[PDB]
Amino acid sequence: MNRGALIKLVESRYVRTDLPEFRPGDTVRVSYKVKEGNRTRIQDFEGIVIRIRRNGFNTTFTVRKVSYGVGVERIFPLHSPLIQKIDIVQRGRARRAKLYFIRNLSDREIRRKLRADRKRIDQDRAAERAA
């Protein structure tokens, strides 16, 4: 018996592979299906990825944004079917895996610490040029 292998077999039915790769510090726009009454639509949530905790299929990530003066954080299951798509708005360069410190920074101070990551931006540009 390989208990770890049996678990992966169960989850393989629900594993997604159509989402783009990103890192904490990147600016990301998540398009999420919402239910309001008896209707379904798509709501976009755009912000800075501050945390990705990995458990294989059970991976989740957290996105932070300031909306109408109030900070908001949303935690998403990475393989959730409720995610329509994820867009890469901006590539950021961080020096650590968890970015809880930006909760106590102003907008100018956040822009200083999370500067654009040139190397990964060029890789996104080199990709998608295969037209």
Partner RNA sequence: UUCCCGGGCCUUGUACACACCGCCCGUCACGCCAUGGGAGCGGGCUCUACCCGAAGUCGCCGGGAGCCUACGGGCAGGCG
Query: From CA 123, how far away is CA 131, in angstroms rounded?
Result: 15
Residue 52, binding choice from RNA, Mg ion, none, Cβ under 5 to 8 Å by partner class: Mg ion
Is 39 among the residues that bind RNA (CB under 7 A)?
A: no
Q: Does 112 bind RNA (CB under 7 A)?
A: yes
CB of 41 to Mg ion, least distance (A): 25
For Mg ion, give the closer residue by CB, 8 or 53: 53
> Which 3-state string (H, E, C) describes 9-62?
HHHCCCCCCCCCCCCCCCEEEEEEEEEECCEEEEEEEEEEEEEEECCHHHCEEE
Q: Is 117 in a helix, a strand, or coil? A: coil
Chain residues in the site for Mg ion (CB under 5 A): 24, 51-55, 62, 75, 96-98, 100-101
Chain residues in the site for RNA (CB under 7 A): 106-109, 111-112, 116, 118-119, 122, 125
